Amino acid sequence: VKVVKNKAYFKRYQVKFRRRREGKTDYYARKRLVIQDKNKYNTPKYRMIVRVTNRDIICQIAYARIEGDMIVCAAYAHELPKYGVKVGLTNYAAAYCTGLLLARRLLNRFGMDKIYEGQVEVTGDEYNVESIDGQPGAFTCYLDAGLARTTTGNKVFGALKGAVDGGLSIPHSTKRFPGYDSESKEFNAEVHRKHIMGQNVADYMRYLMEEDEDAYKKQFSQYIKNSVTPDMMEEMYKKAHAAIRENPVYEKKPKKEVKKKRWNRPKMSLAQKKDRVAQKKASFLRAQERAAES
Amino acid sequence: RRPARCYRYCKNKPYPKSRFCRGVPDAKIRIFDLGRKKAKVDEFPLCGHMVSDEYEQLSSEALEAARICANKYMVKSCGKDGFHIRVRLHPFHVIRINKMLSADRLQTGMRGAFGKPQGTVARVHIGQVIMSIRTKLQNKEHVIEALRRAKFKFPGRQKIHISKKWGFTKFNADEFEDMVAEKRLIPDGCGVKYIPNRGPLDKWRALH
Amino acid sequence: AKSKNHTTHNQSRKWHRNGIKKPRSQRYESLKGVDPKFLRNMRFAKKHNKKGLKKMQANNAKAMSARA
Amino acid sequence: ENPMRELRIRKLCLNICVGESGDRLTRAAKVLEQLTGQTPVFSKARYTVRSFGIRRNEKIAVHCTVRGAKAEEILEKGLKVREYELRKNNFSDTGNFGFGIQEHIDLGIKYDPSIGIYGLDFYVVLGRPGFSIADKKRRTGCIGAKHRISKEEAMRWFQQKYDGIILPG
Amino acid sequence: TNTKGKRRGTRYMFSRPFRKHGVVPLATYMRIYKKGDIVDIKGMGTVQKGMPHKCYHGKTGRVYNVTQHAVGIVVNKQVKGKILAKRINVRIEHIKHSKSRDSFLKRVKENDQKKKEAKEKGTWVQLKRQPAPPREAHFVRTNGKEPELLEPIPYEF
RNA sequence: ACGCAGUUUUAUCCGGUAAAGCGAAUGAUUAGAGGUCUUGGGGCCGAAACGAUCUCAACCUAUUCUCAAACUUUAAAUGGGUAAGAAGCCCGGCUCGCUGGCGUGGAGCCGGGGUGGAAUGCGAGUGCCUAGUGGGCCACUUUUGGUAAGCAGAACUGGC
RNA sequence: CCGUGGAGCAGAAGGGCAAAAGCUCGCUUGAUCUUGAUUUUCAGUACGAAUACAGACCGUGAAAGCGGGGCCUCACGAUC
RNA sequence: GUCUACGGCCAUACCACCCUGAACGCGCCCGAUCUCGUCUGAUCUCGGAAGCUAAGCAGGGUCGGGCCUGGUUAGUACUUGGAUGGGAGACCGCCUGGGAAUACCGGGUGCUGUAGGCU
Ligand SMILES: [Mg+2]
Ligand SMILES: [Mg+2]
Ligand SMILES: [Mg+2]
Ligand SMILES: [Mg+2]
Ligand SMILES: [Mg+2]
Ligand SMILES: [Mg+2]
Ligand SMILES: [Mg+2]
Ligand SMILES: [Mg+2]
Ligand SMILES: [Mg+2]
Ligand SMILES: [Mg+2]
Ligand SMILES: [Mg+2]
Ligand SMILES: [Mg+2]
Ligand SMILES: [Mg+2]
Ligand SMILES: [Mg+2]
Ligand SMILES: [Mg+2]
Ligand SMILES: [Mg+2]
Ligand SMILES: [Mg+2]
Ligand SMILES: [Mg+2]
Ligand SMILES: [Mg+2]
Ligand SMILES: [Mg+2]
Ligand SMILES: [Mg+2]
Known part of the structure; x- marks a missing residue:
């Protein structure tokens, strides 16, 4: 009675995009991140895609073709107890850990293990990856922030x-790492x-543990119910980086199958649909015959 | 008022009343139904319509005079509320006038030869219906005589046809009395709603 | 003194007096207009082709004459 | 018998629309500071009236959004002023309701001679776990149909909690 | 007197037709444009930077230069005097491939395979593309039913 | 055999006119029906009361009448471009100061292998010098202005 | 809460645009210097306008990249 | 038979309503001390893991609205070329070829690449 809401709006509704209606892309940044300049005619443009989800971070490096996106290497957060980090899987420490695991696994796939060791002693300085002449050059990659605000x-x-x-040659600035002061322009490496x-x-x-043990028992429960103490965390990440750098080979799971399958309801056929309609017709005629007398 | 001998069969593109005209006067005709306007569908069975033969232009003043003559003959024949006439044709084309002598040569030659909007005519295709009258079964000859009296007043040659359809709807009069009672057609004032089978089931539940 | 202003009448008949000609043939096409960084590639590549193609292509010609 | 679908206080809006800018609007912002313990935010144009003297881009209203236990406390004070008796047309069709008060010293404020007598709008929205879907930046999805808050659910919530009266007249 | 500027007749030609207003697809970018590729020109209203001209819409040219985010195409344009090969710089969004050259290369590869089979097995294969031949003396079937008699219908208005 | 075509065919793109539609966006425009949200005008129960109700206007819903050179979902016929090979494929190798995980990509250079790759017709390419011309008209078809013209102005083709 | 361009993009219209080319905020003058090529009217001459480049110094951004004026179509000028 | 991250095709995949979801995974969720930005930890960032599939999400359904495809409309409206064809004109008919759309009716409503995990 009020508005003329939806009569031909459904007929002239231009849909945006599948991924955009799902809410996972923007394409105003993807159109400039992905697409390589055409002077090279075949050269893939490598992008490190870092996605943050609840209980799991995903670090990948991929390039693009017309059929889709081709992923060269991939790392995750749920495989960190195999390398040592049992708990605390979605922190800055596991982010650095997953990035180091992804870089070591990519260089193990390419076979560039002995050269380009990177920054072994983790100090948090601006150690940019240099290219050594007479050797295969560094890996040039570019970031993907996605929809996350930087x-x-x-x-x-x-x-x-x-x-x-x-050991991935990615151009970046030091003013977006944590520890950068917002007012003073100097960057602190000890804080980082x-x-x-x-x-x-x-x-x-x-x-x-000093102020209120009620919150310490409410949250951080998996920590205290296997083991977490700060001296063992400071030794634990230090051992975990060496455990990454000694064996990034990514042993897989056989999984093969136990082939049994019934979960999802299939579609009903055209004759079944029309016979449901016919049963509705016959049942309503039976109701018109019966309830008008009764 | 220039004669209709200088405004005739189509020669120009259609020039309707729009954002670009802004100077057309009001058309002569304003109303189109003259008979029982609130009539139902089952009241007047038959209809006769007036088919053009020549690809011509009909003027709104000729439509005015023809609907007045047809209304007068209908109220003399079958009285008030015994018919329903509808002028199917609607005027939209706007003719132009290049007037002069405004007895001298000293006003303007063919300097600016663009016309001011004079009147409104209607371009008629071959076979396009001018008028349609729905009446009772006993008023078959009176519709023919009314459209015959309008034939002498419209220009050009045009014919008459008593339609096979049940009045203004697009459905046949033979299938009308056999099909409006059982399943499909429900009367909606003077119009007829046709329901398909591809609807929601709630409409069929509200029916029957 | 009004005259006929503009027309294209009797023009295609004048065009087809001579059989309108495609350029139809440029073997080893013209090189100007191409990217100057690509030209900085290609000129140095051509003069080092003039310099250092002799001995390796000579030994390859000897090898392919020995094989076939 | 209902899995974690509980109505709660999502936010509470506080609005004072003063007919002129300057001293009275600044003291209204001071009143909202005395309530909330945090600074208000000003409003502006999109209409110019001239029948009483406002212009384009003037500070006409002050407003503030309060969330949490402070919002529950100010809601308690507002329902204490109205004595838990709303009317039926206060509830909107989307499940949210406003009532507003006059005489802001009735909330528990020592009246200063310099400030004056102001009125204060109270507008409550209702919340369920899962209303961050339309607000988060990544996947802006719909709320749903069996999840949205209705007129009947809002008025039965106000019947159940705080012991409110509908006043259908 | 028509005030020949740039794009004076392009109310419909540089427009997106229907259900296509929005961002450009990325498969338009993710293509291989090399030298000698026979390409087509189709104007786009989304990217207002490197559309060629209203005259070159729908035409077909040859690629001579490729740059960072555009391409260079030579086009035979017809003017009053004679047709001319003209060097244009067009962006990537306005340009697609031409499937005619790809179909010709498929026909050349099929002719090469048939020529190799002919040299192997001594079979004369008739690899020339003959046009549509006249129909041979084929044979019809009318069993079971007589041929249906048709007569034109009377005129009914 | 080199090659060419006011031509056709085989593939490949391009358009936005004719048509058609507006129960599809924009602009107009006709009539009836149903519904009760809302204010505006009459009437009844009557101190008065969205306390109840008759009537009317607007709005909405599903229809229906007629169109648009400066409207369009759709979309012709006609028409325009490209390809139908030895200047084309395939293999092997050098150079690059371009690019860069990689002898990665891309261009150039060198050597070798097989030419029977739509129809029809025609022997082709190219250089110099220069006269006259720069007032046009008519005809089928598509059209602009005008009432119309042996009127004025456009498109293709043909003629004077 | 519904809301596909029904608003806005400096002005006359047309095209185009929604985590945008629209609104707000933070820095900055790439509205910088220089040599060629091409398109547009075209005689394939010029002016004006525009496009892809190349070489310096840069601005922004985490980077990708973007920018050598205005989202595009006009807003401007020879000899001496 | 599925999901997650990045996608290609851009509504066969959108919108309204009702059911189903075992194991991973996605989420809602529990709180601001550090990095963080707001009137507000609502949004963005920070360390989780007490519940839940109510919602997002993945499926199914609606004689569903739209979309696409196929008949009818229709060899009809149009149209290349032709005539010493008709008609005062308006237009119409024939030879040769090409040949569209709405109401009406029927059918579908996602396909796949890379990398990873659950029965
Ligand atoms: Mg971004
Ligand atoms: Mg002249
Ligand atoms: Mg046009
Ligand atoms: Mg038309
Ligand atoms: Mg001479
Ligand atoms: Mg003339
Ligand atoms: Mg003359
Ligand atoms: Mg002669
Ligand atoms: Mg909304
Ligand atoms: Mg505009
Ligand atoms: Mg527009
Ligand atoms: Mg932006
Ligand atoms: Mg530069
Ligand atoms: Mg803080
Ligand atoms: Mg702070
Ligand atoms: Mg929270
Ligand atoms: Mg559920
Ligand atoms: Mg859920
Ligand atoms: Mg569904
Ligand atoms: Mg349906
Ligand atoms: Mg014809």
């Missing part, structure tokens, strides 16, 4: 720091190394 302290930059210390090693959340565990 603020100082976002762990997509921690995955970037892991990639750079693993502290935030890599996760001493601030160790200080927060100390804060919870």
Whole structure:
């Protein structure tokens, strides 16, 4: 009675895009990130895609073709207990850990293990990857932030720091790492190394054990119910980086199958649909015959 | 008022009343139904319509005079509320006038030869219906005589046809009395709604 | 003194007096207009082709004459 | 018998629309500071009236959004002023309701002679777990049909909690 | 007197037709444009930078130069005097491939395979593309039913 | 055999006119029906009351009448471009100061292998010098202005 | 809460645009210097306008990249 | 038979309503001390893991609205070329070829690449 809401709007509705209606792309950044300049005619443009989800971060490096996107290497967060990090899978420390694992696994796939060791001693400096003449050159890759807002302290930059210390030549600036002061233009490396090693959340565990044990028992439960203590965390990440750098080979799972399948309802056929309609017709005629007398 | 001998069969592109004209006067005709306007569908069975033969232009003043003559003959024949006449044709084409002598040669030659909007005519295709009258079964000859009286007033040669359809709807009069009672057609004032089978089931539940 | 202003009448008949000619043939096409960075590639590549193609292509010609 | 679908207080809007800019609007922002303990935010044009003297881009209204236990406390104070008796047309069709008050010293404020007597709008929305879907940047999805809050659910919530009266007249 | 500027008759030609207003697809970019490729020109209203001209829409040219985010195409344009090969710089969004040359290369590869089979097995294969031949003396079938008699219908208005 | 065509065919793109539509966006425009949200005008129950109700206007819903050179979902016929090979494929190798995980990509250069690759017709390419011309008209078809013209102005083709 | 361009993009219209070319915010003058090529009216002459490049110094951005004026179509000028 | 990250095709894949979801995974969720930005931890960032599939999401359905495809409309409206064809004109008919759209009716409603995990 009020508005003329939807009569031909459904007929002239231009749909945006599948991925855009799902809410996973923007394409205003993808049209400039992905597409390679045409002077090279075949050269793939390698992009490190870092996606943050609840309980899991994803670090990949992929390029594009017309049929789709081809992924060269991929790392995850749920495989970190195989390398040592049992708990704390979605922090800045696991972001740096996953970036280092992705870089070491990519260079193990390419076979560039002995050269380009990167930054072994984790200090948090601006150690950019250089190219050695007479040898195969460095791996040029470019970031993917996605829909996440790039603020100082976002762990997509921690995955970037892991990639750079693993030995991936990615151009970046030092003013978006955590520890960069917003007013003063100087950058502090000790604060950044502290935030890599996760001493601030160790200080927060100390804060919870000193102030109120109720919150320390409410959250951080998996920590205290297997084991977490800050000296073992500071030794644990230090051992985990060496456990990455000694064996990035990505042993797989057989999985083969136990072939049994009934979960989802299939589609009903045209004759079944028309006979459902016919049963509705006959049942309504039976109701018109019966309830008008009864 | 120039004669209709100088405004005749189509020679120009259609020039309707729009954003670009802005100077056309009002058309002569305004209404189109003269009989029982609130009539139902089952009241007047038959209809006769007036088919053009020549690809011509009909003027709104000729439509005015023809609907007045047809209305007068209908109210003399079958009285008030015994018929329903509809002028199917609607005027939209706007003719132009290049007037002069405004007895001298000293005003303007053919300097600016663009016309001011004079009147409104209607371009008629061959076979396009001019008028349609729906009446009772006993008023078959009176519709023929009314359209015959309008034939002498419209220009050109045009014919008459009593339609096979049930009045203004596009459905046949033979299938009308056999099909409006059982399943499909429901009367909607003077119009007829045709329901398909590809509807929601709630309409069929509200029916029957 | 109004005259006929503009027309294209009697023009295609004048065009087809001579059989309108495609350029139809440029073997080893013209090179100007191409990217100057690509020209900086190609000129140095051509003069080092003039310099250093002798001995390796000579030994390859000897090898392919020995094989076939 | 209902899995984690509980109505809660999503936010609480506080609005004072002063007919002129300057001292009275600044003291209204001071009143909202005395309530909330945090600074208000100003409003502006998209209409110019001239029947009482406002222009384009003037600070006409002050407003503030309060969330959490402070929002529950100010809601308690507002329902204490109205004595838990709303009317039926206060509830909107989307499940949210406003009532507003006059005499803002009735909330528990020591009246200063310099500030004056102001009125204060109270507007409550209702929340369920899962209303961040339309607000988050990544996947802006719909709320749903069995999840959205209705007139009947809002008025039965106000019947169940706080012991409110509908006042159908 | 028609005020020959740039794109004075392009109310319909540089427009997206229907259900296509929006961002450009990326498969338009993700293509291989090399030298000697026979390409077509189709104007786009989305990217207002490197559309060629209203005259070159629908034409077909040859690629001579490729740059960062555009391409260079030579086009035979017809003017009053004689047709001319003209060097244009067109962006990538306005340009697609031409499938006619790809079909010709498929026919050349089929002719090469048939020529190799002919040299192998001594079979005369008739690899020339003959046009549509006249129909041979084929044989019809009318069993079971007589041929249906047709007569034109009377005129009914 | 080199090659060419006011031509056709085989493939490949291009258009936005004729048509058609507006129960599809924009602009107009006709009539009836149903519904009750809303204010505006009359009437009844009557101190008055969205306390109840008759009537009317607007709005909405599903229809229906007629169109648009400066409207369009759709979309012709006619028409325009390209390809129908030795200047084309395939294999092997050098150079690059372009590019860069990679002897990766791309261009150039060198050597070798097989020419029977739509129809029809025609022997082709190219250089110099220069006269006259720069007032046109008519005819089928598509059209602009005008009432119309042996009127004025456009498109293709043909003629004077 | 519904809301596909029904608003806005400096002005006359046409095309185009929605995590945008629209609104707001933070820095910055790439509205910089220089040599060629091409398109547009065209005689394939010029002016004006535009496009893809190339070489310096740069601005922004985390980077990809983008920018050598205005989202495009006009807004301007020979000898001496 | 599926999901997640990046996608290609851009509504056969959108919108409204109702059911189903075992195991991973996606999420809602629990709180601001550090990085962070707001009136507001609502949005963006930070360390999780007490519940839940109510919602997002993945499937199914609606004699569903739209979309696409196929008949009818229709060899009809149009149209290349032709005539010493008709008609005062308006137009119409014939030879040769090409040949569209709405109401009406029927059918579908996602296909796949890379990399990874669950029965
Ligand atoms: Mg971005
Ligand atoms: Mg002249
Ligand atoms: Mg046009
Ligand atoms: Mg038409
Ligand atoms: Mg002479
Ligand atoms: Mg003339
Ligand atoms: Mg004359
Ligand atoms: Mg002669
Ligand atoms: Mg909304
Ligand atoms: Mg405009
Ligand atoms: Mg527009
Ligand atoms: Mg932006
Ligand atoms: Mg530069
Ligand atoms: Mg804080
Ligand atoms: Mg702060
Ligand atoms: Mg929260
Ligand atoms: Mg459910
Ligand atoms: Mg859910
Ligand atoms: Mg469904
Ligand atoms: Mg349907
Ligand atoms: Mg014809």
